Amino acid sequence: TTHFTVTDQWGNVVSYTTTIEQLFGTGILVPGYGLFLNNELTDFDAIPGGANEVQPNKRPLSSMTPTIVFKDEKPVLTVGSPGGTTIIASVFQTILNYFEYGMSLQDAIEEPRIYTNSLTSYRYESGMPEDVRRKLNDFGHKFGSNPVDIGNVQSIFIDRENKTFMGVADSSRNGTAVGVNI
């Protein structure tokens, strides 16, 4: 899964999340074509009979969450990330950090995240204070004994007041932001 974003001088805004699922997908490479092939159908439920059971011609449920945020009919921010089912949680947290904490965009991105889907799945980014993790686990959580990076937000903020775009690439990988003038 990767997420990227683009903004032009004629107002268009692109938030694009996109994947082959697992890294290298199934691993399969179309022979003598070099093309890697997705395992996406394993996003479908294994035991059948629920909303997200396998069906011919059906699409398996995704977690992808490319987003654009608008203040006053006009798009001001763009957010998205990879990270499997943790995506929902990354974007959620990025938006909180940026709009509820009033953090800079990069700061909101970099600010350590958690993720937890059930009582048996917990992850946290390095930065979670130890005293705090400990006191959480006393309370009934299961943040394990060592951290992991969660997700990869790329994002552009649209600055009317200064008439520019500010683009940021999450540190989790070697991504990059660059703007164009003239």
Add this chain to the structure above:
Amino acid sequence: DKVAVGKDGMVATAHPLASKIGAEVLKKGGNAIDAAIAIQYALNVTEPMMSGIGGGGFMMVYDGETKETSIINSRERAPEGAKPDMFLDEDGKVIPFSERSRHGNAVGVPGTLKGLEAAHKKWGTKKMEDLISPSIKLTEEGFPIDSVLADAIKDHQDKLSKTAAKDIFLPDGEPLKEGDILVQKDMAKTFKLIRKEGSKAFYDGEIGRAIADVVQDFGGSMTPDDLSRYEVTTDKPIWGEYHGYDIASMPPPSSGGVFMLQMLKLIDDFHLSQYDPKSFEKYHLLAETMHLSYADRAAYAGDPEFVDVPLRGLLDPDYIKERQKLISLDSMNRDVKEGDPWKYEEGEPNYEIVPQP
């Protein structure tokens, strides 16, 4: 650089060589969609484990101009031979994720190329020889691999060893290290062919047929028919308001939009910024909130052409209030079931709630 500012465009992507080329496209007057397309090909070559024309995507765009917002939904579809229980062994037991993950049954009909064509034509104003050519150069003449790619190839030696991939990502018995030059001659072949005869190399060509071969060679049920049938779809966003902003996100068949909005709706009333960002309080309310939303996702989320997702119910003001009951600072909820959002939307589930592992 990881942070930077510009007047007339901005591109931000996962790979430095993918950023780069989109920017070039904007500098030569190409629009954001043109550039996005270019980037996706570039990422396919430079970040091959992550994104690809052998996969799916969701492309959200704000228009010009018309000021409407839409999504090019190029998510893969299951071939007609797929079956609800294809992921069980003969004993009715779920097949190991490691096993399901490499099998032909896992492969959905790739839609990314069809999605690029949809986007370009709607908002395209370039090409369609220009935006894949620079990717052809990187595939043909190669580029040095970054750490993320280097690690991916190391961390997945064994999956890649079993496929045609091993020839080129596992040159002899080892995997390329950071800085090694990655050449994808065959991928360049395919990319050149994409530009020349258009997409239908893929949905009606060698390529489509060749994929049908391999999916079956690995156990899967994909035919060239399936590939010829595939078409992307356009979605209008799911919307939300939060903190006086207006949010456009992905609707079903993604779980992302609904539950990220629900996550915000749940957490909004808690005025989180009262607490320090690295405090017990924040973490606990986040954790509790995630449990609720993720439970809802596991019970109610699927492709809406086939199922009913209570979008209205899952975000109902009174539903949110009900569920927010279950989120306190004075203990952790251990009773983490799905809510009943159906009590707030008109309908009934056309499916059950089935546990997964």
